[PDB]
């Protein structure tokens, strides 16, 4: 709406009075410049059509560890601490998917080293929503077992790496001087002279509550799951994350990785779609079992198929 400045300096330490130091805010942080309408461009999220995830007896009564990160259960895979930046998109629908989705063609589809191609999502499924303004995971996950995807290998992300500080820590251009449509949908290679390979899962399904989420990432790895963005998430710096005050801005689709306690507060790491510059390194941690802005009322993934025979 407005491009009146989200963060103020009494807005932040009201928010810090308020979590009782639970999380630290930062009101000078990478954010303070951040515009009302160009906070709620970053949350994609807009609009189950899948099957609810079932475990079978051998899964269900696992005794699940008190910690869990997904980069140590399969230190094998470097897909899985590489941090997605969507620039200056609602692409996190999408960028969260490829995301898991490449993180997943390792823990399940057998292949090491494979960047899904999220501008490809981005850009050609339609019922998914109306792309870099706003989209829908469940069917992000539908089009990969329906139609399926290229590699980023075969058809990069469109977009630059964007910073919202005047002066970026490792030198990106600003955000603020972008405004990004949905890209074309092209059928070749963005390097005609680079084979077009294809990349489908052979499944897709449906995760609710605290349970399943952490169940489901244990044994098949990182998911994608969305949450309600407010005012304070964006002075986010560090600790474990609740909402304690702020406006609505929208639905915001991000990529879960683990679980933890801090001082008996227990948690959920999560890959954010935004820099290495925000937050604890890119991450993330909000509150684990209250299930804070909705974030474990709905998840979504799938199962890659291992390419040839
Ligand atoms: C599908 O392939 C086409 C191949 O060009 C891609 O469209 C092009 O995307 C590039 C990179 O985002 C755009 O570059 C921009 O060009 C303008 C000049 O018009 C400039 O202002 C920017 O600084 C930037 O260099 C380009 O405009 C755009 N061209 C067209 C015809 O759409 C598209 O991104 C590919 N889509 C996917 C999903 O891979
Ligand atoms: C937000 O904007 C402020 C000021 O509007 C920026 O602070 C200035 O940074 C410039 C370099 O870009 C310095 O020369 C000055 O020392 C600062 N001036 C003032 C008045 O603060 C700041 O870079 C921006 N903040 C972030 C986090 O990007």
């Not at 989209?135 to 399926?148: H, L, N």
């Not at 008996?264 to 290495?276: F, L």
């Amino acid at each position: 709406a407005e491009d009146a400045p989200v963060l103020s300096k009494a807005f932040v330490d009201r928010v810090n009075r308020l979590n009782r130091g639970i999380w630290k805010a930062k009101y000078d942080g990478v954010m303070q410049n951040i515009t009302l309408r160009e906070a709620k461009r970053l949350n994609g999220v807009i609009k189950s059509i899948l099957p609810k995830r079932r475990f079978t007896e051998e899964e269900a009564r696992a005794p699940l560890p008190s910690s869990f990160d997904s980069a140590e259960a399969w230190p094998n895979c470097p897909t899985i601490p590489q941090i997605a930046d969507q620039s200056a998109c609602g692409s996190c629908w999408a960028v969260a998917a490829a995301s898991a989705m490449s993180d997943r063609f390792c823990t399940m589809g057998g292949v090491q080293d494979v960047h899904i191609s999220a501008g490809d999502l981005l850009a050609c499924c339609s019922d998914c929503g109306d792309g870099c303004n706003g989209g829908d995971p469940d069917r992000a996950w539908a089009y990969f077992s329906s139609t399926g995807l290229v590699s980023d290998y075969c058809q990069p992300y469109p977009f630059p790496h964007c910073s919202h500080h005047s002066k970026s820590k490792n030198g990106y251009p600003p955000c603020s001087q972008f405004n990004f449509d949905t890209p074309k949908c092209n059928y070749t290679c963005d390097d005609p002279t680079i084979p077009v390979v294809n990349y489908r899962s052979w499944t897709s399904y449906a995760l609710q509550g605290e349970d399943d989420y952490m169940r489901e990432l244990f044994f098949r790895g990182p998911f994608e799951v969305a949450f309600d963005v407010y005012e304070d998430f964006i002075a986010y710096n560090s600790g474990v994350y609740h909402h304690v005050s702020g406006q609505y801005l929208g639905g915001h689709a991000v990529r879960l990785v683990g679980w933890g306690t801090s001082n008996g507060v227990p948690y959920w790491k999560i890959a954010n779609s935004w820099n290495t510059e925000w937050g604890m390194d890119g991450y993330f941690l909000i509150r684990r079992g209250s299930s804070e802005c909705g974030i474990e009322d709905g998840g979504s993934a799938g199962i890659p198929l291992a390419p040839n025979t």
